[PDB]
Amino acid sequence: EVMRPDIVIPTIDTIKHEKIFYDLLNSKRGIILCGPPGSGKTMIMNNALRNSSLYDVVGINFSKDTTTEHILSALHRHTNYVLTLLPKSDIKNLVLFCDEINLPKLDKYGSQNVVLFLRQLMEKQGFWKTPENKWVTIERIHIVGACNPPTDPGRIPMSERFTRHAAILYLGYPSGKSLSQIYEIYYKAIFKLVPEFRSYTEPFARASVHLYNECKARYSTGLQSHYLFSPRELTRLVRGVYTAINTGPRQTLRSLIRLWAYEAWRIFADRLVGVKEKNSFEQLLYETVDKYLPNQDLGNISSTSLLFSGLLSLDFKEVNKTDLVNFIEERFKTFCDEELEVPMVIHESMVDHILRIDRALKQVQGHMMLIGASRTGKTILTRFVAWLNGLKIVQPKIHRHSNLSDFDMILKKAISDCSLKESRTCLIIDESNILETAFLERMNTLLANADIPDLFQGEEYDKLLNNLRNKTRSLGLLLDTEQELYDWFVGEIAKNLHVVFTICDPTNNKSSAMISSPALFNRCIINWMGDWDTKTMSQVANNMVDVVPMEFTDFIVPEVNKELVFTEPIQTIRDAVVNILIHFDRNFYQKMKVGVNPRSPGYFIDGLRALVKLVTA
């Protein structure tokens, strides 16, 4: 049950908030919940109302482009007209959800509309109908809210005229003891699978909470704009450990610690940008394991020493590096034979990244974002891993003279292929594929919700429902109401559609807004391709130059400093060529004042190809 997202662990804070929230709802007062993006305001909110026998839930998600038509449609599905508006339930008072109230945008003259409509509904106790010009009386409908503080770049400050009538609450981050208890319950539930290690529930909960605490304390938002850690990351770590254990072999303590370290590597440190930051994370992992688990026989737990794959067997188990590299090379040769041919070279970093992308893609509702310089092998890797898992590539061919219309058609066709035809698709989106912010808002609607209701309206909605009924009857399921068909359709979309984003230059304003979006940053897994480190470039050069003979001159070994040689210690002339090329590339990028901008290594590959051609001639 840890896979399903409607569960809580009752600690003191959540029951206290539920009690005060019942008091505030029963006091005929509007409620506004304001807190950090990871405090689980929506989680505790749905826990409070869903278990209640006195109130009901209606689902509205605000966007930048949102009008009162959505609110009217949502209330029409649960209320009735007698001029007085009353809910369908005669005992439970309807409670109207409104998350991300800061997200609707100001008009041309510095004001918002939906917040004023909500204010008129909650303090004038009604509104005026637009086409019939009639007053509306509302008796037992309450309003709730969940919005972030306006300090983050993208939240619009709200007028005091609306916050006047609604109570305000702050949901702080749960403390160490509460998180420890919650994740103790999580790990007891997750270790019911392997009873041989039931006694290790407490040290793992302590280790996860402590490691999250230090990873939050060290890497702040000053260094990077995407270091927004939250307990959501710990919950996703729990989900990853479950999806690894449930599909794994017979389990030992050493392999348990290695699995937990691999999950921590692939969920906390995949977004780190600096080599020294990664070394600090490695030292933190060492000291955490040493402090809370006095266990020996634990080997290297770096990124290149923890390789867990499902491709090499029927289960999620650790695999040898050499066998993995050979299997990847042969499968990739077959891929180039069957698909587009590209002279890609195999190295350890690309194996690590292809396995982490494979781990991301196998998850249900799994989406990830790739941040790295151009010509670093991102879209080709995504297509390769999608071909490995039997996915379907739907690459949106968007040209300059494009608009929202063709993008809407390609999204609609992808959704129809995913749902009606029952074919899994791995949608790829490049940085240049988002022209205006409207496509970004469409992506927000697609990912924050399970679908885009705007793409299906009127006759499109009717034919979509008819096709859904035809598919349901073809499968042989007794579904007749529109709610069940719609929920099954969005379940199929959430289960059989994965979006993977390709971002080239994160320092751009469009990229900054794209990675600053709240409905996109939290759900996706952030992966930093970055630029190649020296070892990867050395491996690529050694694998690319050896095809042509270099040894025809007597060479003397030059005595130089250890830090000046990036290849393994030099004994031939090929290593001299590798060192000279890497040194020139580093000096050139340093003397062009690129700054902290990612350094695209395509110059290096082009130089190597020109080198081998010219030396052959």
């Binding site: 698909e339 041919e341 151009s374 080239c504 025809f552 082009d606 030396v615």
Partner: protein, 306 residues
């Protein structure tokens, strides 16, 4: 000269990719640090290396000069850095747009002008790649991503014929097809996807090029006979080396065997040609210090000009 080639290949290959979008001063500085770095790692290079004299032969140099390219060495090595790209699509960036005529002269009637702002662009483009005609594109600052497969050369070898996917349909390509991109905006924003896959070559004119052109005008007007003598001696040295090689080929073909007057005459001609080579080299040895003195004497004019 063979314990030296691998240093001379790496300085030339690295000249092709990294030095596309740098001007004279940065090129000089980076070439100096490359030579020092090669010296640090003990790989022998040519102390008298010149990129044009290493890759641009006199025939192709004259063929490029007659097409319309200016006589400046920077434009010569940039024409070399463009035309020697067999794998990566090159990018041409000249505000003057002067070398569309040059590439039209080089490719003759095969040069077909296209522009990203055209509406029938895609149809004539797929036609041109079908017949394999050389294609010239204008207004690259408004790059259309529909040619993403052509830019990265993501073809597939379907059978014995190579194939690319343009637009929404399969099209065929031919081996004689080459593509060029010309732009007129030096500060025009370019997508990083296009920039990282092309050879960004800057055909611009800075203050350093002002100094170089002032020095060129001073040499070609103040003492023009000595520069003419340099050009004449370079041409005759190349011709004499070619004639010496032809005479040696004649001597080796005169082995016969299924001495005679023809073989002795060939040997005497080879002797005369080798003596001419030695005399030309001895005369040219005391001619480059005149260039050194002229460079050291015509630098204040460049400094004042800049």
């Amino acid at each position: 000269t063979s314990q030296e080639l691998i240093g001379n290949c790496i300085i030339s290959s690295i000249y092709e990719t990294y030095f596309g979008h740098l001007n004279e001063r940065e090129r000089g500085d980076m070439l100096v640090i490359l030579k020092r770095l090669l010296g640090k790692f003990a790989v022998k290079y040519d102390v008298n290396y010149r990129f044009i004299d290493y890759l641009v032969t006199l025939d192709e140099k004259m063929k490029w000069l007659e097409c319309g390219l200016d006589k400046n060495d920077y434009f010569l090595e940039n024409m070399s850095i463009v035309m020697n790209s067999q794998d990566a699509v090159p990018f041409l960036l000249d505000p003057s747009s002067h070398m569309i005529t040059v590439i039209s002269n080089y490719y003759g009637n095969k040069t077909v002008l296209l522009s990203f702002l055209e509406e029938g662009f895609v149809k004539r483009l797929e036609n041109a790649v079908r017949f394999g005609s050389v294609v010239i594109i204008q207004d690259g600052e408004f790059f259309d991503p529909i040619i993403s497969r052509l830019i990265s050369r993501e073809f597939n070898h379907a059978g014995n014929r190579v194939t690319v996917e343009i637009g929404d349909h399969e099209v065929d390509v031919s081996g004689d097809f080459k593509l060029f991109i010309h732009s007129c905006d030096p500060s025009g924003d370019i997508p990083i996807f296009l920039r990282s896959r092309v050879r960004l070559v800057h055909f611009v004119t800075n203050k350093e090029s002002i100094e170089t052109r002032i020095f060129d005008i001073t040499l070609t007007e103040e003492n023009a006979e000595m520069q003419r003598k340099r050009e004449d001696l370079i041409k005759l040295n190349t011709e004499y080396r070619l004639k010496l090689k032809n005479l040696e080929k004649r001597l080796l073909e005169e082995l016969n065997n299924s001495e005679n007057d023809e073989l002795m005459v060939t040997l005497n001609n080879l002797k005369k040609e080798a003596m001419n080579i030695e005399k030309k080299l001895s005369e040219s040895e005391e001619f480059f210090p005149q260039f050194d003195n002229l460079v050291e004497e015509y630098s204040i004019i460049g400094k004042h000009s800049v």
